[PDB]
Design an enzyme around this catalytic site. Structure first.
Site, PDB file in Angstrom:
ATOM      1  N   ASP A 104       0.782  -1.177   0.038  1.00  0.00           N
ATOM      2  CA  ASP A 104      -0.013  -0.074  -0.027  1.00  0.00           C
ATOM      3  C   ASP A 104       0.967   1.087   0.110  1.00  0.00           C
ATOM      4  O   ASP A 104       2.043   1.100  -0.444  1.00  0.00           O
ATOM      5  CB  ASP A 104      -0.958  -0.014   1.104  1.00  0.00           C
ATOM      6  N   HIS A 160      -3.624   5.935   3.730  1.00  0.00           N
ATOM      7  CA  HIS A 160      -4.693   4.846   3.391  1.00  0.00           C
ATOM      8  C   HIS A 160      -3.827   3.636   3.482  1.00  0.00           C
ATOM      9  O   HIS A 160      -4.445   2.440   4.157  1.00  0.00           O
ATOM     10  CB  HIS A 160      -4.595   4.817   1.583  1.00  0.00           C
ATOM     11  N   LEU A 181      -3.445  -3.003  17.245  1.00  0.00           N
ATOM     12  CA  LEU A 181      -2.993  -3.636  18.558  1.00  0.00           C
ATOM     13  C   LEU A 181      -4.407  -3.779  19.482  1.00  0.00           C
ATOM     14  O   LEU A 181      -5.110  -2.930  19.584  1.00  0.00           O
ATOM     15  CB  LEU A 181      -1.912  -2.937  19.211  1.00  0.00           C
ATOM     16  N   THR A 208      -6.577   1.301  23.905  1.00  0.00           N
ATOM     17  CA  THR A 208      -6.678   2.457  23.014  1.00  0.00           C
ATOM     18  C   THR A 208      -7.194   2.397  21.816  1.00  0.00           C
ATOM     19  O   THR A 208      -6.863   1.401  21.333  1.00  0.00           O
ATOM     20  CB  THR A 208      -5.434   3.376  23.101  1.00  0.00           C
ATOM     21  N   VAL A 230      -8.094   1.607  18.131  1.00  0.00           N
ATOM     22  CA  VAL A 230      -9.123   0.527  17.724  1.00  0.00           C
ATOM     23  C   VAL A 230      -8.778  -0.844  17.807  1.00  0.00           C
ATOM     24  O   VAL A 230      -7.562  -1.095  18.756  1.00  0.00           O
ATOM     25  CB  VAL A 230      -9.282   0.754  16.081  1.00  0.00           C
ATOM     26  N   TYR A 265      -7.576 -11.635 -10.999  1.00  0.00           N
ATOM     27  CA  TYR A 265      -6.951 -12.810 -11.508  1.00  0.00           C
ATOM     28  C   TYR A 265      -7.146 -14.052 -10.612  1.00  0.00           C
ATOM     29  O   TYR A 265      -7.600 -13.805  -9.309  1.00  0.00           O
ATOM     30  CB  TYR A 265      -5.050 -12.702 -11.201  1.00  0.00           C
ATOM     31  N   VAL A 315      -6.175 -14.617  -6.934  1.00  0.00           N
ATOM     32  CA  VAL A 315      -6.246 -13.538  -5.981  1.00  0.00           C
ATOM     33  C   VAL A 315      -7.758 -13.475  -5.455  1.00  0.00           C
ATOM     34  O   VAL A 315      -8.573 -13.625  -6.167  1.00  0.00           O
ATOM     35  CB  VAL A 315      -5.654 -12.238  -6.275  1.00  0.00           C
ATOM     36  N   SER A 348     -10.797  -1.189  -0.579  1.00  0.00           N
ATOM     37  CA  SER A 348      -9.867  -1.274   0.148  1.00  0.00           C
ATOM     38  C   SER A 348     -10.000  -1.274   1.651  1.00  0.00           C
ATOM     39  O   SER A 348      -8.776  -2.158   2.213  1.00  0.00           O
ATOM     40  CB  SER A 348      -9.134  -0.024   0.207  1.00  0.00           C
TER      41      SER A 348
HETATM   42 CA   LIG Z   1      -5.725  -0.660  20.287  1.00  0.00          CA
HETATM   43 NA    NA Z   2      -9.497 -13.362  -8.290  1.00  0.00          NA
END
Ligand SMILES: [Ca+2]
Ligand code: NA
Ligand code: NA
Ligand code: NA
Length: 274
Positions: free
Chosen positions: A32, A63, A74, A78, A80, A170, A173, A220
């Site tokens: 990314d 992103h 984690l 705190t 998320v 593909y 994937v 994404s």
């Molecule tokens: Ca956390």
């Molecule tokens: Na695929």
């Protein structure tokens, strides 16, 4: 206090986490825009940058850091909480600051992950056409035992047209599309024969630079849910091949309607990790 984003219980990652399976020592490469490694809610253990002028462990865009937090924020008091909060996270920067990259940069990133023994590649990126080199890079990654996950595309639907992007399109994937907090398809989510599973994608809250938390919409956001899910299955059943992990995510997905719009449906990692 730690917020738990709706997507974590929606795919039932919390149910697997409570059994004690969190993706420990599963290596997940996020290809990314980089990751803000200094974020207090993220541990980045290594990676590599194929983008001129930017180091793998900073993120000028945000992103990559958001996508990373969904795989692996984690588990603490705190921020998320990620789908697989114990994974070894690798930042493989294949997208610049403005959120784009060459097929060459992407290919190099896939090969880097394959060479360095990643268990899971997440690609929250897509193009209309892809290439011969990219195809072979994803194929070799998959044949070598990597679970390869990509965002289907944010092109929506339009009559009977196939709108799945590359590399999601593909065969090697997993093309992930996007639902919202009510488990309904988000309208921007790409459609087509290759669409494989759905995961949370609209209104996804995650880590974001600098040291904060943000909501984004897109396939994404959905892709990393599946990447993390892959990590969780691996941590519970360490000998499964890439193809077995992939078939478990698929075959146990909660059906939501036509596969053209949903693939096999919403991932359920509790059912998949059984
Ligand atoms: Ca956390
Ligand atoms: Na695929
Ligand atoms: Na950190
Ligand atoms: Na395989």
């Amino acid at each position: 206090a730690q917020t738990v984003p709706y997507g974590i219980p929606l795919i039932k990652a919390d149910k697997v986490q409570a059994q004690g399976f969190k993706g420990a020592n599963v290596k997940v490469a996020v290809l990314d825009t980089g990751i803000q490694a200094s974020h207090p809610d993220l541990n980045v253990v290594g990676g590599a940058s194929f983008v001129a002028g930017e180091a793998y462990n900073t993120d000028g865009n945000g992103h990559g850091t958001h996508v990373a937090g969904t795989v692996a924020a984690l588990d603490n008091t705190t921020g998320v909480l990620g789908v697989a909060p114990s994974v070894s996270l690798y930042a493989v920067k294949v997208l610049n600051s403005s959120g784009s990259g060459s097929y060459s940069g992407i290919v190099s990133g896939i090969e880097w992950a394959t060479t360095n023994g990643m268990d899971v590649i997440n690609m929250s990126l897509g193009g209309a056409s892809g290439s011969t080199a990219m195809k072979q890079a994803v194929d070799n990654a998959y044949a070598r035992g990597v679970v390869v996950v990509a965002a289907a595309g944010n092109s929506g639907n339009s009559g009977s047209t196939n709108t799945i992007g590359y590399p999601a399109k593909y065969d090697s994937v997993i093309a992930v599309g996007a639902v919202d907090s009510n488990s309904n398809r988000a309208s921007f989510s790409s459609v087509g024969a290759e669409l494989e599973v759905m995961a949370p994608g609209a209104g996804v809250y995650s880590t974001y630079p600098t040291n904060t938390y943000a909501t984004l919409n897109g396939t994404s956001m959905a892709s990393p849910h599946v990447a993390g899910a892959a990590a969780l299955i691996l941590s519970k059943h360490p000998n499964l091949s890439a193809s077995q992990v992939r078939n478990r995510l698929s075959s146990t997905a909660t059906y939501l309607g036509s596969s053209f719009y949903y693939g096999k449906g919403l991932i359920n990692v509790e059912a998949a990790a059984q």
